Amino acid sequence: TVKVCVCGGGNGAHTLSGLAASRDGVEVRVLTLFADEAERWTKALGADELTVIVNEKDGTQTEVKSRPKVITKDPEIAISGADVVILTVPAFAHEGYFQAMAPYVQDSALIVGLPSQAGFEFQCRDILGDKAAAVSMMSFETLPWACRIKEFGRKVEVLGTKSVLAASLIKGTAKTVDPLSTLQMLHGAEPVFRLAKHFLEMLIMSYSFVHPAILFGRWGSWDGKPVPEAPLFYQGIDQATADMLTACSNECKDVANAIMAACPGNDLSDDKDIYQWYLEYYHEDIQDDHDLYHAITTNKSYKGLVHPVKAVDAGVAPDFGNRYLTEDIPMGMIVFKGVAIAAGVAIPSNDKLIMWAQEKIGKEYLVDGALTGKDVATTRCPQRYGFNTLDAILTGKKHHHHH
Ligand SMILES: NC(=O)C1=CN([C@@H]2O[C@H](COP(=O)(O)OP(=O)(O)OC[C@H]3O[C@@H](n4cnc5c(N)ncnc54)[C@H](O)[C@@H]3O)[C@@H](O)[C@H]2O)C=CC1
Ligand SMILES: N=C(N)NCCCCN
């Protein structure tokens, strides 16, 4: 039997619990530490099975029905004996699960971030301590599905499910169940999971700048004047924002190259241009792909997608807060900035974006190019956990003298 603990009670948690529990020889324990979400889910589901509606490419809908073994807020029941522990929650909830699982997680456990967001492994290492080197840490780029709960506890819809998805892996000393094939089995035929060469590649390939860039490209020098209605998001970018995304992406390559040169045996060559990335994973949706601007603006899976806005005098105004900034900055850009400092690589365009973004949401992470902001302890930059060197970042071991 493979024993999976699904952490969370969101769209993803519902879907993953639904899908994973439908597989033969799989036992699912749902863990959720959000107050009494666990009891609520339980009362709601009753004696029925959890239902997942999957929208196929045919336009048809397949119904998956299954039941988890237990739905609980008790980590001892959820984590003990678990072969795989999958965290599917907004990144701010990760700290709580790592803290809860710590004294119950076995050496052999595969600890999965679905999705991880940036700094997932640094946090995991810090919280689990000496147990971190034993377990394996798996980081997935994004969520496998586009999904929404329809009826809490008992029904979730997959609007679409990704064709391919990448994940990185830090192997522990303990032999886990096979990370890639086990995860694949839980998800079914799709996405077709591939293994990223190195976890830092996966972290950098998050392109945490993307959403901060887009918001800046449309609201950067915003004269305060309202607009009639929510402007297009991705499809609404101009040439300047495209260039900005190219600049940031290059800064990603810069950091990647610096690590490789300072640290032999760390293959980060799969860090590619955002433009080169778009064509790899959206080609069938892009009608005009001669450059990055056109690659993004003619992307058919970006149509109808608009900025978050709110009602103001004489029209509509950008709605910051959201998760483009409250997540992508502390759980994204800052982490990348932490690696950039450790590599010694300047990244003026990422910096430009951080400084602007944090002000919008009334947070402070970066000050004078240095990670000394008011709320820097709420981020996952490796420096926050005392991982200050590339070696510390890579291996999780601090230094270490010795009189
Ligand atoms: N289609 C989708 O739902 C997409 C979501 N994602 C990403 O995947 C991640 C998971 O997505 P969802 O499952 O939709 O997230 P969600 O927003 O549905 O998750 C809500 C869950 O977060 C936890 N939570 C909320 N407030 C909390 C609190 N203050 N303290 C402790 N726990 C709390 C609870 O368990 C709650 O059930 C997100 O980071 C999202 O950005 C990525 C692609 C698509
Ligand atoms: N890391 C990637 N390759 N893609 C990120 C998916 C977008 C999540 N906002």
Is 383 annotated to bind a ligand? Reply is no
Length of the chain, in residues: 403
399 is catalytic: no
340 and 334 Cβ atoms separated by less than 8 Å: no
CATH of 1-205, one of 3.10.180.10, 3.10.20.70, 3.40.50.720, 3.30.160.100: 3.40.50.720
Cα 291 to ligand 1 centre (Å) = 34
Name residues contacting ligand 2 (CB within 6 A). Answer: 141-142, 205-206
Whose alpha carbon is nearest atom 9 of ligand 2? 142
Query: Alpha-carbon distance 151 to 155, whole Å?
Result: 5
Residue 252, beta-bridge partner list: none
SS3 state of residue 54: strand
Estimate to the nearest angstrom the gap between the alpha carbon of 121 and the chain centroid.
12
- CATH number 1.10.1040.10 given to 206-403: yes
Please report the atom of ligand 2 found closest to the CA of residue 277.
Answer: 3
Q: By CB neighbour count within 10 A (0-12 exposed, 13-18 middle, 19+ buried), where does 386 fall?
A: exposed
Whether the CB-CB separation of 157 and 147 falls below 8 Å is answered with: yes
154 known member of a binding site: no
Place of tokens 């809860």: 100
**Ligand 1 centroid from CA 35, angstroms:** 15
Tell me if the bond preceding 14 is cis, omega within 30° of 0. Answer: no
Secondary structure (DSSP) of 109-135: -EEEETT--TTHHHHHHHHHGGGTTTS
Determine the atom of ligand 2 nearest the C-alpha atom of 141.
1
Judge whether 37 is annotated as a binding position: yes
**Considering only CA atoms, which residue is closest to atom 6 of ligand 2?**
142
Atom number of ligand 2 nearest to Cα 142: 6
Substitution site in 168, 198, 207, 282 for ligand 2 pocket (most atoms within 8 Å of beta carbon): 207
Closest-lying ligand 2 atom to the alpha carbon of residue 210? 9
User: Can you tell me the distance from the alpha carbon of 111 to that of 89, in angstroms, rounded to the nearest whole number?
Assistant: 14
Cα(401) to centroid of ligand 2, in Å?
Answer: 40
Rounded to the nearest 10 degrees, what angle do helices 274-282 and 239-262 cross at? 100
DSSP character at residue 286 = B
**What phi and psi values does residue 270 have, to the nearest 5 degrees?**
-80, 5
**Resolution of the entry in angstroms:** 2.8
Has 220 been labeled as part of a binding site?
Answer: no
> Which of helix, strand or coil describes residue 215?
helix
Experimental technique = X-ray
Rounded Cα gap, residues 104 and 241, in angstroms: 47
- Among 14, 211, 290, 403, the active-site one is 211
Nearest to 70, CA basis, from 111, 21, 112, 113? 21
CB-CB neighbours of 118 under 10 Å: 29
* 3-class secondary-structure state, position 24: coil
Alpha-carbon gap, residue 78 to 3, rounded angstroms: 10
Distinct helix (H) and strand (E) counts, the chain = 14, 14
Exposure pattern of 221-257 as b/e (b: 16+ CB <10 Å)? Answer: eeeeeebeebeebbbbbeeebbebbbbbbebbbbbbe
CB 391 within 8 A of CB 344: no
Domains of the chain, by residue range, sit at 1-205, 206-403
How far, rounded to the nearest angstrom, does the alpha carbon of residue 245 sit from its chain's CA centroid?
19
